[PDB]
């Protein structure tokens, strides 16, 4: 049978095709995992955003904390200063009467 | 005799099938590269976020010591006021005694 080279060639066409199907299938498997990798890298990111606002909103608090704190401090410093001037003047008048 | 008609017909199908599968593989493969490009993008963007973020936390710490710095100086400022005060009070008590005797 000169059917041998034909036979042999339909053989190879089939092999070719199933090798290609194997390849398609494996590429498709890879995509599905890469696509979850893709997915996860975005979904993790989002969670990260909310960590950021949470933190940046703490920043906001602290600034209005520091400011109020600075302000209390200026107010205390004026008080100390005025109380000490009350002391200086009392000194001053005592040393005067001392001598007239 | 038997034309080869059905044999060459069957061969062309097998070729077509092989061709269809190859198309399939190379689109999937190209698509696989789509995703891996994006992957190589976010992992890098994720890395980016955290550095901005740690620096944001680094800013926030800087604004906690500063708060507590003022807390203390305020403590000092009071002790100072209260001591100055006790002193005028003591001078007052003394003047009163003198004028009384």
Q: How many CB atoms lie under 10 A from the CB of residue B39?
A: 19
Show the tokens assigned to B18.
Answer: 């092989």
Q: Residue B7: list chain A partners with CB under 8 A.
A: 6, 10
Q: State the burial class of residue A79 (Cβ atoms within 10 Å of its Cβ: 0-12, 13-18, 19+).
A: middle
Which chain B residue has its CA at the smallest distance from A17's CA? B18
Resolution attained, angstroms: 2.5
Give the method of determination. Answer: X-ray
Three-state DSSP state, A99? coil
CB of B25 less than 8 A from some CB of A: yes
Closest residue by Cα to residue A23 from B9, B67, B28: B28
Name the residue among B64, B82, B35 with its Cα closest to residue A58: B64
**CA B99, CA B90: separation in Å to the nearest integer?**
14
Rounded Cα distance between B38 and B36, Å, is 5
A28's CB contacts (< 8 A; 6+ apart) are B28
Give which of A42, A24, A14, A27 is closest to B45, Cα–Cα.
A42
The tokens for A23 are 């390849």
Task: Identify the residue whose tokens are 């034309």.
Answer: B3
Q: B100: exposed, middle or buried (C-beta count within 10 Å: 0-12, 13-18, 19+)?
A: exposed
Q: Is the dihedral of CA A25, A28, A34, A35 positive or negative?
A: negative
CB-based contact (8 Å) between B31 and chain A?
A: yes
The answer to whether residue B86 neighbours chain A at the CB level (below 8 Å) is: no
| Residue A22, helix vs strand vs coil | helix
| Structural domains in chain B plus CATH codes | 1-101 (1.20.5.340)
Please say whether the beta carbons of A67 and B68 come within 8 A.
no
Which residue, chain included where needed, has tokens 């608090």? A61
Q: How far apart are CA A6 and CA A13, in angstroms?
A: 11
All residues of chain A having their beta carbon less than 8 Å from the beta carbon of residue B90 are none
Distance CA A19, CA A66 (A): 70
Compute, in degrees rounded to 10, the torsion defined by CA atoms B73, B75, B78, B82.
-140
Contact predicate A81/B84, CB 8 Å = no
- DSSP-assigned letters across all residues of chain B: ---SHHHHHHHHHHHHHHHHHHHHHHHHHHHHHHHHHHHHHHHHHHHHHHHHHHHHHHHHHHHHHHHHHHHHHHHHHHHHHHHHHHHHHHHHHHHHHHHH-
CA nearest to B7, candidates A60, A77, A1, A86: A1
User: Which ranges of A1-100 does DSSP label H, i.e. alpha helix?
Assistant: 3-97
Tokens of A94: 């005592």
């Amino acid at each position: 049978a000169s059917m041998e080279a034909i036979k042999k060639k339909m053989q190879m066409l089939k092999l070719d095709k199933e090798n290609a199907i194997d390849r398609a299938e494996q590429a498709e498997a890879d995509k599905k995992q890469a696509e979850d990798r893709c997915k996860q890298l975005e979904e993790e990111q989002q969670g990260l955003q909310k960590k950021l606002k949470g933190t940046e909103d703490e920043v906001e608090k602290y600034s209005e904390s520091v400011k109020e704190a600075q302000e209390k401090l200026e107010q205390a410093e004026k008080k100390a200063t005025d109380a000490e001037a009350e002391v200086a003047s009392l000194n001053r008048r005592i040393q005067l009467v001392e001598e007239e």
